[PDB]
Amino acid sequence: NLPEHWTDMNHQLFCMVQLEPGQSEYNTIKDKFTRTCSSYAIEKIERIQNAFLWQSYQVKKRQMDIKNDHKNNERLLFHGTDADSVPYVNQHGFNRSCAGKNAVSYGKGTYFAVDASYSAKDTYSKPDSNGRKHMYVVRVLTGVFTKGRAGLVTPPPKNPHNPTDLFDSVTNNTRSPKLFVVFFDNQAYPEYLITFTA
Amino acid sequence: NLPEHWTDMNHQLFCMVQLEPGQSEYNTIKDKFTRTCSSYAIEKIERIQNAFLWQSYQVKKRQMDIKNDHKNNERLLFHGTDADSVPYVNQHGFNRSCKNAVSYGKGTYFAVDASYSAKDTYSKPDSNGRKHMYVVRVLTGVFTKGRAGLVTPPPKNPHNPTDLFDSVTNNTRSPKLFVVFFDNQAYPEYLITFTA
Ligand SMILES: O=c1[nH][nH]c(=O)c2cc(OCc3cccc(Cl)c3)ccc12
Numbered sequence A: 001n002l003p004e005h006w007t008d009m010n011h012q013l014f015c016m017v018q019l020e021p022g023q024s025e026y027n028t029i030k031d032k033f034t035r036t037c038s039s040y041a042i043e044k045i046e047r048i049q050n051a052f053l054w055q056s057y058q059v060k061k062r063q064m065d066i067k068n069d070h071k072n073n074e075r076l077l078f079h080g081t082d083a084d085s086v087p088y089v090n091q092h093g094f095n096r097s098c099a100g101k102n103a104v105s106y107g108k109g110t111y112f113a114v115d116a117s118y119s120a121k122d123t124y125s126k127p128d129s130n131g132r133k134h135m136y137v138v139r140v141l142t143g144v145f146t147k148g149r150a151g152l153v154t155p156p157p158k159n160p161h162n163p164t165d166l167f168d169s170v171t172n173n174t175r176s177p178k179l180f181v182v183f184f185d186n187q188a189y190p191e192y193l194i195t196f197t198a
Numbered sequence B: 001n002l003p004e005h006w007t008d009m010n011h012q013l014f015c016m017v018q019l020e021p022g023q024s025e026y027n028t029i030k031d032k033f034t035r036t037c038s039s040y041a042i043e044k045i046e047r048i049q050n051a052f053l054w055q056s057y058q059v060k061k062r063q064m065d066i067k068n069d070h071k072n073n074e075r076l077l078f079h080g081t082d083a084d085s086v087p088y089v090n091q092h093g094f095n096r097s098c099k100n101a102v103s104y105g106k107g108t109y110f111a112v113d114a115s116y117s118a119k120d121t122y123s124k125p126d127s128n129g130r131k132h133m134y135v136v137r138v139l140t141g142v143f144t145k146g147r148a149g150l151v152t153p154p155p156k157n158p159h160n161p162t163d164l165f166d167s168v169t170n171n172t173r174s175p176k177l178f179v180v181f182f183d184n185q186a187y188p189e190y191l192i193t194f195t196a
Helices: A024-034 A051-067 A083-092 B024-037 B051-068 B083-092
Strands: A014-018 A041-050 A074-081 A110-113 A133-141 A145-147 A169-171 A179-182 A188-197 B014-018 B041-050 B074-081 B108-111 B131-139 B143-145 B167-169 B177-180 B186-195
Touching (some): A014 A083, A024 A041, A024 A188, A041 A051, A051 A133, A051 A188, A051 B051, A074 A083, A083 A133, A083 A188, B024 B041, B024 B131, B041 B051, B074 B083, B074 B186, B131 B177
Parallel strands (some): A145 A169, B143 B167
Antiparallel strands (some): A014 A041, A041 A188, A074 A110, A074 A133, A110 A179, A133 A188, A169 A179, B014 B041, B041 B186, B074 B108, B074 B131, B108 B177, B131 B186, B167 B177
């Protein structure tokens, strides 16, 4: 079930693949980034090939496709993080118990941005001792979402009289979403790592 | 690809099935409980048929079987909870984000002995006196002693910080509880409703 554009991994379960500028795959990520981060320069873009993270994520995606009536349940979003977190995210993905409090909190989960500019803030993509900033491009199962509240540890119910039937994610604003919060493991696959500088 | 002992669900994805007293499955689960809780009264035992939870759990189990290359990664453990939490666990399983004692880390706790889970602090009696305890398949895998404040298991090797233990315990030689720190590492298989 591993994607056919992935490099052959010689029977290993994890690899970071450096992309080539001028390939469509590099250029669509570079364009998505520069749309709001034109004042930064990209050092490199790496494709994350993590067999176990992919399998768990693809099972969640297939479940949400069945549960939800004909929705586009997946969005491609950004996540800025510090260099110390990069090896953990590459191997294990996004853990809500490691997440910082957001400056505007819509719940206690993992935050993902519509715009690279948001994730490029030093508060998220902290410059390392060589001045490198790190941002992931992430497949996120946003599914059916509502406006969040600082108190949430899971997405709220769709209906107060059916407390277990939940929204898939929450946002800052349902009309004009700029961030999404997910509260479960394997609801986000880190697909690319962008290393960039001021 | 759902287990053979499950009963037909009329093409639905979630069902709680009450077991028949005196049949093999009911007797097996009743014996596990009465090993340490023979003084309690069993009202009923329900088989939890949650296709989505089962699929996500079986994926984790296949992954852990490959990674550990050995094979006894699974233990059958107990979890007492309050009646208000039962509908959530039936649908969504165990969630570390939901304060009882967490001295061995911030995960979900499971007991080796039903008697521990049977304490009123875990299986809180409801207004009709009913107590609730799950029998749980847990991917304990390779484990180490836990400690306060862990948000994931420790690494197996300090020079490889991302290769983790699968779970932690109070005591590696003679464990009485296990903590898991990830979703879909535990599948709630039966729900025992009982009284003091
Ligand atoms: O069945 C349970 N349901 N919910 C729990 O939080 C729970 C917790 C639990 O160990 C907590 C603990 C921690 C340190 C020392 C000791 Cl001695 C005990 C055991 C069972 C349960």
